[model samples]
Target chain A: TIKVGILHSLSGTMSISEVSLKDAELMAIEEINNNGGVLGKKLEPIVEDGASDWPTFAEKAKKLLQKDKVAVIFGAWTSASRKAVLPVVEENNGLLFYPVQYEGLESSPNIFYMGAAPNQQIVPAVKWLFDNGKKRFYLLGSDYVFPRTANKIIKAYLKYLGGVVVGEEYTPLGHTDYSSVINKIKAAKPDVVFNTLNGDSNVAFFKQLKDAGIDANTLPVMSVSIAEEEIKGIGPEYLKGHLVTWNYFQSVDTPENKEFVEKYKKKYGEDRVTDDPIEAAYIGVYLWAKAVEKAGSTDVDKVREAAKGIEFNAPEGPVKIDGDNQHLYKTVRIGEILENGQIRELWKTNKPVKPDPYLKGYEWAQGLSEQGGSH
Target chain B: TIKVGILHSLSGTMSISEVSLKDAELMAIEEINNNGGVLGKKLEPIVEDGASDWPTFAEKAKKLLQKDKVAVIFGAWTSASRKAVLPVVEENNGLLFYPVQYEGLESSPNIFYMGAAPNQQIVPAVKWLFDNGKKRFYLLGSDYVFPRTANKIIKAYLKYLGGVVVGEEYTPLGHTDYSSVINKIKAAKPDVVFNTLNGDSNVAFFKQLKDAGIDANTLPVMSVSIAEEEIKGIGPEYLKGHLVTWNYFQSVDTPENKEFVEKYKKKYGEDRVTDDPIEAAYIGVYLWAKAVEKAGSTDVDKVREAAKGIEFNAPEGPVKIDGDNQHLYKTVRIGEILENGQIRELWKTNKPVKPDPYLKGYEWAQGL
Candidate 1:
């Protein structure tokens, strides 16, 4: 068996989000193993629980890499826990495929970030808004590196696009009180609420936004984090008619996704759902496995080198792994939330957007905007 | 100007179908020029007409390659003309991009088929019929290599899949009479008619079928060649609710297609129609240009080598060049003729089906 590590928070607060990622990765492993295995060996997933403790993630990752000698690690739902395992993998010279959107500005030689790199998700979401003739905006998010960094990029982009930022605020993680934020939103009277709230706070934020008499019709909230898996927890009452952005949705209307959804539901019970992070997690294994086959071994350098510019016809159209930044060229989709808790894709980028982790391509992102250095 | 050849039947029986293709290829060349020409050189298309004569196609292709020294040629709607041009291309070391779905079992080193193979169109159309509970099929087509070989594959596949063929018939190209076929259909009482006829015969057959007290609602016909352009001439009164299978349609329901159709109509006229052959013709230029861009030169051998595995977000979906056989990995789609002379897709293959030009992969295809 080819040993690979399945590291995620399986207990405590983070378990709610990270557990699905674990299930998705295992399903990918199962599928790959059934299909003649990778390089003539089954992927024996050695699962390790972070237990929502950042230190536990590091220690478990260390054991999996050092003792169990896992060839690679796939885990991390948040930036903090991801950073926790980053050093462990780096010290062990291990390969880690972190499948989540995070605050951009970090790329380690040992890790491949399969999720959006700020530019892929955060920038395109606002670009769609701006292109659709929205000039006023309000920003909201959880009080963390992700929300703060994302809001920073959002602020710079909107200002660069000659738009107005009426109000910007943040709340502590897991905080439920949005009454004051709703009051601030009303006072600002902006066109849309750009949301980056993570964890259970998304549920609290949307319900309060609706309860405060602000429905999705007048002041729709567009999110970077909410997906089918999260929307199922958020429920249809709070999310109908709203919008969200991601690369993959349950209702993607493609044959690849249709088959993937059927296989996932059959294996993980009919109630199970798939989302962006779950999809990224699944394709990450295949991407890694394909490189392994090309390299003829799982050595870190060999696999990583072979992964450059490798393309796969993923469920969300074609995705190519960028060797320059270890990020994926993904199609960014803005979807309208339907009454059935599925997404109706309203607009797509027409093609996959290259990974712009450093935002090198965007004039606004690189701080060379016309508004720059003006009093 | 980087001279290229435009070899199509410009003033003959096939002009109705071939003109739209010539227009599409020019539009592609125009778009490339507007953006920045391939290899930093504006493409110069050297035009020629076959006049629906097979030998004329070969002579024109030779002139384009030998006299004009064009980089590549894009043309030929009918298989007979394609065969005529094939030897010329091989003899002159020319690149001919033939953009029309035809019978499989041939792959020349000097030609690239941008159309559907027998497996891509005919086999899938019948498979959809069988899976949708059609037990008996009546085969109809124009007497040619495309339709005859397509029917041969369809018959083998249906027999392999345990279905019955109640009737089979064919008429020469441009043959207007279909009364005998309708009488045979009425007598046989087949569940469906698998039509492979091309050109103007479609108009007469559908009109005669509807006149015989049979509407598309009761016994529909599934077609391999009837598309938006053909349906316009056939008229919606006869073709509505009938089925056709191809890779692309005007109503493909994609952002890429919307833009493509709008641009096409804007450049030509609003009444202009786009069909499967037109879309393939348009993409053939881009695919070749992209390969030229990749190879850094317009040399035939270099572009051919670089053309392998090149991908483009085609209007149909993502299409890639199969280095193995020089055909395209195309998505197979089944569409129903809507009332507005448009095709609404009813079914699509799960992904881009690999090019099986030799029918090598199908158990029922190769004498199995």
Candidate 2:
């Protein structure tokens, strides 16, 4: 018998983003079963809810990995939830595919990073600004591991590139008041603003940025975490010419992505929008199945070893396992928030860039480690 | 003072793809000037002919960068032309914005890649086919850098996905006889055909595929490079229901894209078709203009620095520069050739993907 675990925050403040990732995971599972399940066995998914609580994620992960003895697990959105589940999976030697673009500097052999690392997403975006003649930047992010660590790397990279940092700020997660930050930006007049704010706060920040008369033309703001789903909440008027960086966009002109959008919308609702994390979740299921089939057993070590170098034609492009770092190779993309609340891709790397979780490739990020890989 | 360079092949085998890119660049330059030029200075465009020759491209680039001292250069449709001008621009410290998707293997600091890379275009298409239940794939392409290297990546990716490759074949750039190849496809009956044949060869191949009774529904052929303009040349009757993958299509339902189509029609005649490279070329000019405005001067290093994060709301959508890699992040899209001689978008990547020219990231891609 084959069982997989799906742990997600279904009813929390992060539900707006995590729910879709859950839905996409289930959809991939259903599609896999329809395609004759993995290894001549029907996949039985054991669903659990972190309930938007970090401790709850660890509890659920323990239940799924210990009690249910699921072969593999696909879930966890926020870095906090992932960190909570990390100890449980590693202790039990369970495989977890975490599908959310996260701040790198952490890697676990027991976990596979299916999202963009800093090298794949943040560093390239910062580089995009530097190549375009942007002189100074302002950093703003939500108060969390993802944003805090991300800005740390951005600060170092900006310093290495000889760009000026006019100001840097943070807001509590979901905090909506952005007038103060808007004033700071107005006073500083940086060439571009690197925004790492997540959730509904993006809505407030962009709206406030617009109210303060800093449209994308005069002062462009490049967000690393915002996506089409967030754009709807932010309102198109506030985001109209603003920029965002990610691995995928809904409007990307491809038959597969169009089909994905259609099926996702049909299953969820017409108003529902698919973003990078949702697509990554969809890929997570398929990659796991491929690994199971290749390894010929659902045993943790066999599947883990087989998963290394495993490639899947993901929605974003052809994504592969780095094997060594337990991270994925993903293409980094920069898009503009259109007036219709859709992202239009402005630039992309030619191929999928390798994940550098430790930032071992860059000299500027030599002494950064937010990982609890002590085990 | 601001002068932009345009070095496109005006006459030769690649004129089909190059001409539209030139037209789109000119249109963007005109629009930028109309909106009031950068730094209170009107933009002057210096247009030249690469003559469909590689050496000519280098000569034109040298003249534009040294003799003309243009603020920024936007041109080159083929990789050979780009490779020819790469050295010239590097030597002169000139900036070139090359707007055509090619096999990803190289990057230059003096150039800004404004088109799709192999991963952004071919790898995504192959993944789409594999995910859609297409098992066996036949590789077909023109013998050239774009097609050959694209097939290399496609073959590696298809094998990695556990799909079987039934056949791999190629023909010269302008070779027209597809009777034997179509016969091979009909006999083999692979689940899908990954077609990379460029130029007139595509026109012949598609017509032959239809004549051979292998439509898209039976053995859907996925093309990596064909677009709206090529659909007309291939004849709609032949291309109907077949697939082509690129970054953009005129049928994309966005207001900016709609406005672009309308404007392009008004300028280039309504009969003209909008394609991926043209849209990319259009974005290149706007990106350069924005960079120039940010730098406040035409000095090469200053403009390059200002261009690092400079973004433009192009007709296709928002695009920004990748300072380290000198490539633009682009959204990958797949479209089907319709009976109306236009391409209808069928799928897309949800966001713009970062450019990676070298497959330096993958473990499976290690030795093979």
Candidate 3:
């Protein structure tokens, strides 16, 4: 059996979200094995819990690479955990498929990003809001590297689009007191709220926004990172009619999606909702399998070389790997939250947008793009 | 650019249903091309109007293979169109993707069935009915190979399960008159209606059934072909509280499905509906691309060899080609029609059931 490593938080604060992603990775492994295995060998997955801890993630990555010697690792939900695991994988020359939409500054030869970058999510979403007559904006987010850096790019892009930034605020990741933010939003009276708040903070933020009597019809909130899985905790009542941008949604109508949703529900439970990262992690496994098959070997160098330009008919749509950047070209989607805690896709890019990690292609995002440089 | 052929009824009677399938195939082609195309060659589609004509379908298949020199073709909604094109493909050594559920007496080296066969649809549907206390069944269908053969299998299976076929009837394709059938159904007092009717025949039958005061609560009709696209014509009022079985629905909750429905609506219209055949056609294009990629060439023999055990994450589910038979391993679904004209999936097979084209696996199906 060919060994593979899966890293994700199965316990701790992030488990509520990351557990589904972990399950999705295992599902892909089972699928690959069911289909006569990859490279004529059954994929033996070695799963290690990150426990929502960054340093623990780094140690786990080292162990998987050095001790387990896994051919590929599918893991990490947060940018912090990704950063934690990054150095170890690079040092050991281990392959890691980081499947989450991040701030998009760092690129590593050892990593293949399966999720959206800044341009794929934020840029297109801002352009959509700008085109749709929502000009004035309020940037609300958790004070973190991802949200902080993402807000910088959004602020820059908004200025370039001739839009006004009436208010910008940030709070600690778990800080739930959003009464102050609601007062500021009332004062600013912006046309839209661009929210980058992650995790449980969204629950407090959206609920408080509703309690403030501000609804989507008046000030529509466009979020990045919120999905079907997140909507349940945020309460569907607070989210109804609001807009969110991502690469995928549970309500997308396709044959592959029907099977995917059905299979996921069957494997996990009926109440479990799939999200962007879960689907990306699923794609990560298949992409690695395909690369291994193409190279006719599971060697890191050979698989990485084979991975370039490799395509998979992902749950979102067709996504292709950008050979140069080790990032996926993803279709951007904008969805309106429904009363059922599900988001209905309102609009999407016609095709998968190419990855621009450093935002070198966009003149407006010149200074705000680069963060960690290269790993 | 790699030329791909699209053969569907752009006009004529079948266009009502077949047109959506053609559009779906094109959408897949566009998506593939948008994602850097297959094998670095942009997919160039050559569309042809089958015009609901069998002979026309064969002519188009020949033209697509011989004249266009296309790598693969996604086409044919009806059994007639498929049968007409099958010989042409076999003769020309061309590859064809047939994206319709049909009679399962045939399989060809040149063809890949992206849609379900009898074992995938009829057999499982019958089993569901039997398990659900629906003992007496009234069979209704369009007069075609698909309906006739499907009824034959259903009849044998029902008998094996100690159930009775109270009545059986057939009507011409797009037959608008169903009053007689409605009266027979009312008189027969069957537990359920197993409808194999396609096209506008469904519209008339469903309307007459509602007029006759037969509702889903009293007697549910389990249809094979009616989907989101068909419900629009039949009217939600007529189809509400009924049941239909297929591989997919427009309302299935999945990230892929949400994008597909959204993209299709954006490309077509907000009022446009997606059905199993349309999804099957969409999957056919992706499956061909995967097979070509696996073979590392678009040559007919190589692609065929690569097609065996090939799988695509289709809109319906993960469908794999049964190595010996080109039929897909599909998960059968039974959905109840809601008031909004959308089918709420009620039950489904736990996993994708293996495709058995000849039904040779079952003892009761022997010599039936």
Candidate 4:
């Protein structure tokens, strides 16, 4: 039996939001199993709980690889968990597929990234924001490596855009106190606030911004994260008139989206949303299956070699993987969240933006955007 | 023609995530109109700018309700925004459809919550966590009314779970620094970290946690917000082995989810990830349509009445609305973010949890 271990936190704070992703993974496994299984063997997904704990993730990784004797494992949502499991996977010579977008600073042969790198998501969004005449910028984000590195890149990109960092600030992840921060933000009012907060923080930040009377007409806040799920938690009044940088919106208005909305509503209810990241998860399984089919095996090394240059017609648009970074081509789009917390597409790259994980495509990204610096 | 207002941040930091909500609303309107319109008259959607500003949300709400005379306005996400627009909606005798999950303890006749309430999403998830042997808690979230309030309820719930709140901390929205916080967490060493952080902060938090050598096995961070959109920016490594607590996941295995995944891939891309809030938005539009159908009119009052007990075969599963609190019946699920960043369902409420916007169903929600 080919055992595939699934590792992640099913309990804890992140679970409040990530449980759906876990469901998606199970769905993929079910689909795989339904389709005559992989390699003529029924897929057995050995479930392990990270319990929203980090060290537990590493421990679970080892258990799945060593004790479970799984051929492949899929898991994780944070760099910490991945870091914890990295050595485990490498040591066990096991395979892992990571399905979330994140700070792009490292790549591993044992792990395959199904999400966008910083260059694929953040840099493009930043470039678009800058191109839209947003010069004076305020870097507001969760105080962590992703935002810090992203802000560094933004600062570098600011130089490229001939812009200036009007102000910069950060808070602890999940921090809620914002009165003082809002006051400071008002004092150093910038053209836009580059927000990188997560979860309930958005609710806090937007409420504070609204309470502080920062309007889009005066100072627009742009984000690279917030989506339909976050929008649901954050009431629209705090989010209305804000812009989000992403690959796709629920309102892309395409035939595919129409069907997706209808089907999602039909299956889950009429209230569910299909955002970019969820779309990525749904697609990752399919893409991998297709790759496996092409390679005619589930062998990690062979699949890895075959995965390069794999191209497909994605729901948002056409996408292709770059041989160098293993990141796929993606089109960048800016969406406007309406009062109801639904996203409205406003701008896009109009074409697929090439994946440059290390920002090798840009002149300014020549050095700073190195292999381990993109994050 | 019926006048309706669509409001959200189309120009602020929150817009990164909120923008899609506007698009979903627009899509609903467009589709509604395409299907012969609402109440036999074409729907006229008046798009207003919350400008990512709270007062402006109230201002725009007033404009839409008083000046523009919109019959119904759908808006608000943050608690402050909801609070800001609550009076506006009530004063103008206009109806507001809020499409998002939130910390419960509130109910408004003027507002219809099309998303999960605290009881629907939060309390139940916590209960599940507790039932599964999680006794110590570390409450972490973006500093805000929701997290603060939610954490308060969580602490109370912990008492009920016979658990303890080992540590609790709040971060400013968009706060990216997590090293110090992680260090503190290591010190407290709670069983689970209940995170309410939102947006890109999740990406940074996870990345920094990894860089600082913290692993989910050591201390898992359960987030109330972080969704697929947030995951896309955080990179897979940062998200691996993490836990997210929400009603839905991109990997949800359902007939509805399969179609959604296929269609989303056909439209957006194969690598895109879908999360709960987005699904909630999509559901909101459909639920609104169903309510309109049930009421047989788009009239705010009639629709509100018809909305009660409306059942939705949501992508996650079947859900129903509770007219009392304007929340829905949802299943609380626990998921594990695989090494690949995709979440796999580990556990879920055996059945849909009833909507309890006021947290009245649970004793722990008393103060929250």
Best by lDDT: 1
Give the Cα error of residue B11 in candidate 1, in Å. Answer: 2.6
Cα lDDT tens digits, model 1, A1-375, are 999988886543455477678778877887888799988998977666675667888887898899889999999877777888889888889999988987676778888989988878888888889998778989898777777878888888888888878888998766778999999999999899998887767877787888889998899889887787777766667899999988888888778999999877654434467889999999999999999999999999999999999998888889999988889999888898888778899988888988877777777666522243311
Question: Which residue pairs collide, candidate 1?
Answer: none
Q: For candidate 3, lDDT tens digit of each residue in A1-375?
A: 998988886544455467567678878887788799986789977766676778889988998899878998899877878989989999999999988898887788999999899889988899999999989989998777888888888888888999988999998765679999899999989999999887667877888889989999989999887787777656678899998888988887768888899888644445557878888989999999999999999999999999999988877888999998899999889889998878888788888899988887888776774455432
Q: What is the C-alpha lDDT of each candidate?
A: 0.84, 0.80, 0.83, 0.72
Error of 4 at B51 (Å): 43
Off by over 4 Å in 1: A1-375
Q: Which segments of model 3 are wrong by more than 4 Å?
A: A370-375, B1-368
* TM-score between candidate 4 and the true structure: 0.50
Candidate 2 residue-wise lDDT, A133-163, digit = tens: 9879899988888888888888889889998
Best by TM-score: 3
Instruction: Give candidate 3's TM-score.
Output: 0.51
TM-score of chain B of each: 0.97, 0.93, 0.95, 0.91
Better of 1 and 2 by lDDT: 1
Candidate 4 residue-wise lDDT, B200-293, digit = tens: 4565677778888888787777777766666654655667777777788888889987875565443232445567777777677778777887
lDDT of 4 by residue, A189-280 (tens): 67789887754467678777888878777888887757776666566667888888777777886776676556544323244566776666
